[PDB]
Ligand binder design. Structure first.
Ligand SMILES: CCCCCCCCCCCCCCCCCC(=O)OCC(COC(=O)CCCCCCCCCCCCCCCCC)OC(=O)CCCCCCCCCCCCCCCCC
Ligand code: HEA
Ligand code: HEA
Ligand SMILES: CCCCCCCCCCCCCCCCCC(=O)OC[C@H](COP(=O)([O-])OCC[N+](C)(C)C)OC(=O)CCCCCCCCCCCCCCCCC
Ligand SMILES: CCCCCCCCCCCCCCCCCC(=O)OC[C@H](COP(=O)(O)OCCN)OC(=O)CCCCCCCCCCCCCCCCC
Ligand SMILES: CCCCCCCCCCCCCCCCCC(=O)OC[C@H](COP(=O)(O)OCCN)OC(=O)CCCCCCCCCCCCCCCCC
Ligand SMILES: CCCCCCCCCCCCCCCCCC(=O)OC[C@H](COP(=O)(O)OCCN)OC(=O)CCCCCCCCCCCCCCCCC
Ligand SMILES: CCCCCCCCCCCCCCCCCC(=O)OC[C@H](COP(=O)(O)OCCN)OC(=O)CCCCCCCCCCCCCCCCC
Ligand SMILES: CCCCCCCCCCCCCCCCCC(=O)OC[C@H](COP(=O)(O)OCCN)OC(=O)CCCCCCCCCCCCCCCCC
Ligand code: CUA
Ligand SMILES: [Cu+2]
Ligand SMILES: [Mg+2]
Ligand code: NA
Ligand SMILES: [Zn+2]
Lengths: 227, 144, 72, 104, 514, 46, 47, 49, 43
């Protein structure tokens, strides 16, 4: 979740978002390097009084000119493909949660055993409790155990939504007639705040996602309490 | 005067340091004294004094290289007009804040943001580097 | 006394070679400055946070103020 | 090509006995675009070529573009003038700093 | 007299003039829409109320700025004015089809405006993804009028593309080859090729969307057998060629401006320019699913597609480094169009590098539909394409009108334009990294401050285009003429004077091989 | 035949500065004021 | 040849050269290419 | 000859700089824009229930 | 590009009238419709 005057990303909770953050730092260092090349060269070579406005050898530098951006793009792309393959392992999950994006609200089914389902609507601005967040607080928070592999199957009833939590590094399309899969783990308990990322009508800003991640025994107590 | 519609076909006196010897003389028609100078020009240059030299160089060409590379001062007035127009933009935004924009939501006053910050630090929101990692959880103050 | 012969032919090329050396050094300097300022401090901050981390105590400190909907 | 045939071809091209205005202007306009302050024998040939077809002010801009093609460093133009002084006082050609054309 | 000259026109210069007028009007329509968007996002709260009218404004801003500002001005106006002048043709090959393409454009604009006026509203984003664009969420005539606007604009640009390719390939002098033409001619050749190779795909896609809406088909209905991923596939198969269309005549314009105002006789590495433009054109057709990295594709498919983004990153790198390399040892004349071209180079480099950051699907998991994408596409479109349009306009306003602009006002306009766009689109990187999604009419409080800063920048850009109008009027308030133009031997369009007459190249050019 | 020369290849007369200034500001102001009146229209609807 | 008093002449004065250079050529004597100096003369009488 | 830019450029530079800084410090400080500053080290936390 | 002296040269006052005309002609309609949005929301 976001704090004022934030420049970089929200910090990581899942392992996946730690490797994504390290790769982002790597590629932004590369972008800073090559932007420094472009800016320093354009600042250099317009600031001379010497002139050379005649015929020049058209092809005598193109081998280095072609292999330097290729090797830097390879150096970018190899950890990109590594972390790209780091999201499709054998999961072997613990829990399976199903989300359906209904017309401007979310619905959650924990139905591995003893079928439980509820709805998530935003707490309105006029009905906020003191201390809570505007546009980011829900009626029923979505309770999961922590440091466990959890399968999360995402779909929608009618239109395209996007179930996204940034701090856990999850963003998956909720497509009607189609069931996408994500895996979610953690390393810290607490509340993680996301919201819809696909255009879905006149209240598209007004569906949040709150992932409350707790220990396993308290998740068991919550599952027994909510049914 | 006004020259006819063939102002593009015939070449023109172009004045730049990339083209040091232009193809057209600047002064096309010449007076009788300038014809006397051109008649004297066929003899040696030793009997040519200072004024004839500078006037014939001004006949053949407009400006020397020192005159055309001079540092005039247009960047100051360009950026001066720039800060004019950005200031007028700012007063337009003063008007728009005063009349167009309505009130702010109620979650921005000091008690609500104080309880908000206490819930931030209470739930340990992003506590590795960003916000809750700048707070003492023993001294109950911010990090110094 | 009188003047010697200086380099007449092509100082644009020698200016380009000394300043392309300067370009590579200063661009590697900008990249290394960003890396040693942001990236490696972030990695060691993550290592210091998670190397000596207890989560049962962290959850107990969160639940002692009534934040979770599941732990009262 | 290398230095000596460049120098020899340009000094022979500016010492054409049937020289006229167009090809002298074209020789200077092609020479100035090179990445090269011109060697003083080429400039000597160009000054005598301007004297051959009875043109004065073209020689003054020839000296001016030797002055301002050197660029920032100022060890070129006094050296070129100090080598070209016998030409400069054998034809009556006047140097641009003494003509008042460098005082802006 | 007026009707036969302008409404019934059959030469390229008049149609290019009407392109310039219509695109200036439509660009200011889009600028008003952008000011409306940044006015909603200025302070927290709802100045307009619901998100439906805001999405209508967002979709209208996208369509008006894409298909009615950069597209007609850039391709049609600059190609029609300059391409028969650069190759030495008296006219276009099919001038009646060019006139028909122009006169189909304001029907498309009127249909788009009527789509906005109908009470349902086409608030879907410029992606017209079903089932949001179906007859359930948008049961009404707004989406249909939007679809027919896209049909009319597509038919206009296919006709223009056909006319451009035949007048470039055929109407050359019989001695010149295709590799002796100017670079803008090459850019509009490759642009017209990808236009007619890409536009029927979206024509078929929105035709099937229309039949899904009103003829009870199930092309994209998941309850009948189809899926919207098929629509996404066809839409982006057009869509990435479309943005390469938006950027390629800008490449030609900046190459011409940088070649002219540096004093060079030719760009450095002409074969490199030609090869890189045909490489970008050939390789923009197989990169489309970088716009669907979160739809749930195969991991091998997205691996292929991010590798495709890297190999499309290399040849435009060759182009930008050769643009740097043709500044070497040139008599750098500090014209306003030079300032537009250097701002093009720097800001387009920044936008392309942010696109390369987005190109990794691993980080496109995080940064999909955030404001980081918005910063990427505005640093390419609203800076590169806009700066190239302004560079071409400042450079060729003596040719089109006959009068020269005041260069001091032009430098001031570039200064406040640069400040406004850079202050508008730099905090959007931080808002995308923090995690504000796209298409939001209200945000949480933590996204407030950058939004506030961003809103201020938009007004500065307003001042820029405001004084831009004055610049044009100042030219016609001065009536200062042109005796002469430097470097008129290399550039053919400057050789008939400013402005050129109605009938040019009745006696055509004399060029021989043997 | 149609007029050839500076300022005559344009679809509007440029011989007066003030009527052309009024023409430019009403043309580009109609452009700038169209979407604002559209937004007023859907606010006035419901 | 021509039908008027001048014609645009494009010179490719060495082979495998990209940029043609264009220049007006009028009546009278033989003008030259503005970088190579090949002589072009205008004889305006054809139809 | 004294051109237009020679002294009027200094006048426009001085006037533009002072007018822009005055009007922007007014519009950032005085008109009541809530900037939503960073609350680190600046707010004290208040105990919510 | 060389420029001729102006056939009908404008002075400073007429350019001030021109920029003020552009500003007022662009800020009256948009500023008027932005000056009251809640009136359109049936205040
Ligand atoms: C009797 C009165 C005098 C004689 C007639 C002239 C005035 C009326 C006219 O037909 O005036 C002529 C018309 C010309 O317009 C047309 O011919 C068709 C324009 C189509 C615009 C469609 C907009 C969208 C419509 C659908 C919604 O002008 C306009 O009405 C407004 C033009 C204003 C100035 C624009 C300056 C643009 C500067 C930037 C580009 C420079 C390009 C240089 C090259
Ligand atoms: C001018 C139009 C234009 C141009 C040129 C581009 C160019 C590129 N675009 Fe983009 N793009 C858009 C317009 C454009 N785009 C638009 C309008 C969208 C929004 C669609 C939507 O709504 O979803 C979009 C969306 C978009 C996305 C969607 C992101 C998302 O949905 O989450 C992505 C994904 O990476 C992307 C990638 C790229 C890449 C990789 C390039 C490359 O071609 C950039 C290469 C350019 C450079 C200038 C770099 C070269 C410079 C160098 C110095 C060499 C570099 C060498 C090394 C780093 C080794 N574009
Ligand atoms: C050509 C494309 C183009 C251009 C120029 C712009 C320009 C701008 N855009 Fe736009 N924008 C898009 C294409 C463009 N945009 C697209 C495609 C989207 C995605 C829509 C979606 O979500 O579906 C988008 C989305 C978009 C949003 C997203 C809203 C949201 O999702 O919440 C925002 C808000 O910040 C925004 C802002 C701006 C701003 C402030 C400018 C400013 O730069 C405005 C200033 C621009 C100009 C002034 C134009 C220059 C014209 C001239 C100078 C006149 C030319 C005339 C002559 C030369 C005679 N844009
Ligand atoms: C781990 C360590 C690092 C590993 C590095 C190597 C990774 C290689 C991944 C290659 C995946 C190829 C693949 O399956 O592509 C699918 C694509 C096909 O995708 P598609 O177009 O069918 O995708 C549509 C998918 N559905 C229908 C489900 C919506 O194949 C190709 O594009 C052609 C064959 C493979 C070509 C791969 C070339 C890669 C380099 C580009 C050069 C040009
Ligand atoms: C222009 C360069 C190309 C565009 C870069 C866009 C990405 C960007 O600005 O990222 C912000 C970057 C990283 O942010 P980060 O360092 O994590 O911030 C938290 C602690 N400072 O932050 C920085 O790099 C520092 C702040 C911006 C400097 C520019
Ligand atoms: C943040 C916004 C910054 C906007 C800057 C706008 C600068 C406008 C002034 C300008 O460029 O003036 C031109 C001037 C050179 O003009 P000139 O007199 O020909 O100089 C030759 C040397 N005697 O001066 C220069 O060209 C000097 C460099 C200033 C402009 C740099 C542009 C980079 C792109
Ligand atoms: C050893 C090479 C190396 O990896 O250097 C890292 C960095 C930039 O080099 P790069 O090619 O980007 O490698 C990133 C690899 N993770 O290069 C460096 O960090 C260079 C470190 C030594 C030189 C420091 C100079 C600092 C100047 C201020
Ligand atoms: C839908 C609109 C179709 C318009 C159309 O088919 O036009 C045919 C066009 C008219 O003839 P055209 O070549 O433009 O005449 C000028 C010189 N003969 O004919 C052509 O331009 C030649 C054939 C092109 C066919 C294009 C069809 C679309
Ligand atoms: C108030 C806004 C209008 C001011 C009009 C004005 O002062 O015009 C004088 C001058 C006209 O341009 P001028 O500098 O004379 O010529 C360009 C030289 N290459 O105007 C300018 O150069 C622009 C000065 C605007 C000052 C504000
Ligand atoms: Cu659901 Cu946006
Ligand atoms: Cu793309
Ligand atoms: Mg999506
Ligand atoms: Na708002
Ligand atoms: Zn030749």
């Amino acid at each position: 979740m976001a704090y004022p005057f934030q420049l970089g990303l929200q910090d990581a909770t899942s392992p996946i978002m730690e490797e994504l953050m390290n790769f982002h730092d790597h590629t932004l260092m590369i972008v800073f390097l090559i932007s420094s090349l472009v800016l320093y060269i354009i600042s250099l070579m317009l600031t001379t009084k010497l002139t050379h406005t005649s015929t020049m050898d058209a092809q005598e530098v193109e081998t280095i000119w072609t292999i330097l951006p290729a090797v830097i793009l390879i150096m970018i792309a190899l950890p990109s493909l590594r972390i790209l393959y780091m999201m499709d392992e054998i999961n072997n999950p613990v829990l399976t949660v199903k989300t359906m994006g209904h017309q401007w609200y979310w619905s959650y089914e924990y139905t591995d055993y003893e079928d439980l389902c509820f709805d998530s609507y935003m707490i309105p601005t006029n009905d906020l409790k003191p201390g809570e967040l505007r546009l980011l607080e829900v009626d029923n928070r979505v309770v999961l155990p922590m440091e466990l592999p959890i399968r999360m199957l995402i779909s929608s009833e009618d239109v395209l939504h996007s179930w996204a939590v940034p701090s856990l590094g999850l963003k998956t399309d909720a497509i009607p007639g189609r069931l996408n899969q994500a895996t979610v783990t953690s390393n810290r308990p607490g509340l993680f705040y996301g919201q819809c990322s696909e255009i879905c009508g006149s209240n598209h800003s007004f569906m949040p996602i709150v992932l409350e991640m707790v220990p396993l025994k308290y998740f068991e107590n919550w599952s027994a309490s909510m049914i | 005067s006004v020259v006819k519609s063939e102002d593009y076909a015939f070449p023109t006196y172009a004045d730049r340091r990339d083209y040091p010897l232009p193809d057209v003389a600047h002064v096309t028609m010449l007076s009788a004294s300038q014809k006397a100078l051109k008649e004297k020009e066929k003899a040696d240059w030793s009997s040519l004094s200072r004024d004839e030299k500078v006037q014939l160089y001004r006949i053949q060409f407009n400006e020397s290289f020192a005159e055309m590379n001079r540092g005039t001062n247009e960047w100051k007035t360009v950026v001066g007009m720039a800060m004019f127009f950005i200031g007028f933009t700012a007063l337009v935004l003063i008007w728009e804040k005063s009349y167009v924009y309505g009130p702010i939501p109620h979650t921005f006053d000091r008690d609500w943001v104080a309880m908000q910050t206490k819930r931030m630090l209470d739930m340990k929101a992003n506590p590795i580097q960003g916000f809750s990692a700048k707070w003492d959880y023993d001294k109950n103050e911010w990090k110094k | 006394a009188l003047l010697p012969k200086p380099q007449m032919r092509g100082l644009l090329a020698k200016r380009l070679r000394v300043h392309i050396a300067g370009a590579f050094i200063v661009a590697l300097g900008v990249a290394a400055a960003y890396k040693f300022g942001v990236a490696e401090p972030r990695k060691k901050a993550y290592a210091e946070f998670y190397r000596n981390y207890d989560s049962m105590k962290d959850f107990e400190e969160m639940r002692k103020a009534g934040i979770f909907q599941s732990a009262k | 090509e290398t230095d000596e045939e460049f120098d020899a071809r340009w000094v022979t091209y500016f010492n054409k006995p049937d020289i006229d205005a167009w090809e002298l202007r074209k020789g200077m306009n092609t020479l100035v675009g090179y990445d090269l302050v011109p060697e003083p024998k080429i400039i000597d040939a160009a000054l005598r070529a301007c004297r051959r077809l009875n043109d004065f002010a073209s020689a003054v801009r020839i000296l001016e573009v030797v002055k301002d093609k050197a660029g920032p460093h100022k060890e070129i133009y006094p050296y070129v003038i100090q080598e070209l002084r016998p030409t400069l006082n054998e034809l009556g050609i006047s140097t641009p700093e003494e003509l008042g054309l460098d005082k802006v | 007299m007026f009707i036969n000259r302008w409404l019934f026109s059959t030469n390229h210069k008049d149609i290019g003039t009407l392109y310039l007028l219509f695109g200036a009007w439509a660009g200011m329509v889009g600028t008003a829409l952008s000011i409306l968007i940044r006015a909603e996002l200025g302070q927290p709260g709802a100045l307009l109320g619901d998100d439906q009218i805001y999405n209508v404004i967002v979709t209208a801003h996208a369509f008006v700025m894409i298909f009615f500002m950069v597209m007609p001005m850039m391709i049609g106006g600059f190609g029609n004015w300059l391409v028969p002048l650069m190759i030495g043709a008296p006219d276009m090959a099919f001038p009646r089809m060019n006139n028909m393409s122009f006169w189909l454009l304001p029907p498309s604009f009127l249909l788009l405006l009527a789509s906005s006026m109908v009470e349902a509203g086409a608030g879907t984003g410029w992606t017209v993804y079903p089932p949001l664009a179906g007859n359930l969420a948008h049961a009404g005539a707004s989406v249909d009028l939007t679809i027919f606007s896209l049909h009319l604009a597509g038919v206009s640009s296919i006709l223009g593309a056909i006319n451009f390719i035949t007048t470039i390939i055929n109407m050359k002098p019989p001695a010149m080859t295709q590799y002796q033409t100017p670079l803008f001619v090459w850019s509009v050749l490759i642009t017209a090729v990808l236009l007619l190779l890409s536009l029927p795909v979206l024509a078929a896609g929105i035709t099937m969307l229309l039949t899904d809406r009103n003829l009870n088909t199930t092309f994209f209905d998941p309850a009948g057998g189809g899926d919207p991923i098929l629509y996404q596939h066809l839409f982006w198969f057009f869509g990435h060629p479309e943005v390469y269309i938006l950027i390629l005549p800008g490449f030609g314009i900046i190459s011409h401006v940088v070649t002219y105002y540096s004093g060079k006789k030719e760009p450095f590495g002409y074969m490199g320019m030609v090869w890189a433009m045909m490489s970008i054109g050939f390789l923009g057709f197989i990169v489309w699913a970088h716009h669907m990295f979160t739809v749930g594709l195969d991991v091998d498919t997205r691996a292929y597609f991010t590798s495709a983004t890297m190999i499309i990153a290399i040849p435009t790198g060759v182009k930008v480094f050769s643009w740097l390399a043709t500044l070497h040892g040139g008599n750098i004349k500090w014209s306003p169009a030079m300032l537009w071209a250097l701002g093009f180079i720097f800001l387009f480099t920044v936008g392309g590098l942010t696109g390369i950051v987005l190109s990794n699907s691993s980080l496109d998991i995080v940064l999909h539909d955030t404001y980081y994408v918005v910063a990427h596409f505005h640093y390419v479109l609203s800076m590169g394409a806009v700066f190239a349009i302004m560079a071409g306009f400042v450079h060729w306003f003596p040719l089109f009108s006959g009068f020269t602009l005041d260069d001091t006002w032009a430098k001031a306009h570039f200064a406040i334009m640069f400040v406004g766009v850079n202050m508008t689109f730099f905090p959007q990187h931080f808002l995308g990294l923090s995690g504000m999604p796209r298409r939001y009419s209200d945000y949480p409080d933590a996204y407030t401050t950058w939004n506030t800063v961003s809103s201020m920048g938009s007004f500065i850009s307003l001042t820029a285009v405001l004084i831009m109008i004055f610049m044009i009027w100042e030219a016609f308030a001065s009536k200062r003429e042109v005796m002469s133009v430097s470097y008129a031997s290399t550039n053919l369009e400057w050789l008939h004077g400013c402005p050129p007459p109605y009938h040019t190249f009745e006696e055509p050019t004399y060029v021989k091989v043997k | 035949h149609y007029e050839e020369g500076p300022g005559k290849n344009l679809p509007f007369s440029v011989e007066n500065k003030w009527r052309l200034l009024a023409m430019m500001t009403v043309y580009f102001g109609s452009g700038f004021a169209a979407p604002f009146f559209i937004v007023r229209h859907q606010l006035l609807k419901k | 040849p021509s039908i008027s008093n001048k014609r645009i002449v494009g010179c490719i004065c060495e082979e495998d050269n990209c940029t043609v250079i264009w220049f007006w050529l009028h009546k009278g004597e033989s003008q030259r290419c503005p970088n190579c100096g090949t002589h072009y003369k205008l004889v305006p009488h054809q139809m | 000859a004294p051109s237009f830019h020679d002294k009027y450029g200094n006048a426009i530079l001085a006037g533009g700089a002072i007018f822009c800084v005055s009007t922007w410090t007014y519009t950032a400080t005085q008109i009541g824009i809530e900037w939503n500053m960073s609350p680190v080290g600046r707010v004290t936390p208040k105990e919510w229930r | 590009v060389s420029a001729k002296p102006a056939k009908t040269p404008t002075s400073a006052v007429e350019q001030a009238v021109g920029i003020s005309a552009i500003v007022v002609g662009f800020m009256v309609p948009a500023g008027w419709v932005l000056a009251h949005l809640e009136s359109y929301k049936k205040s």
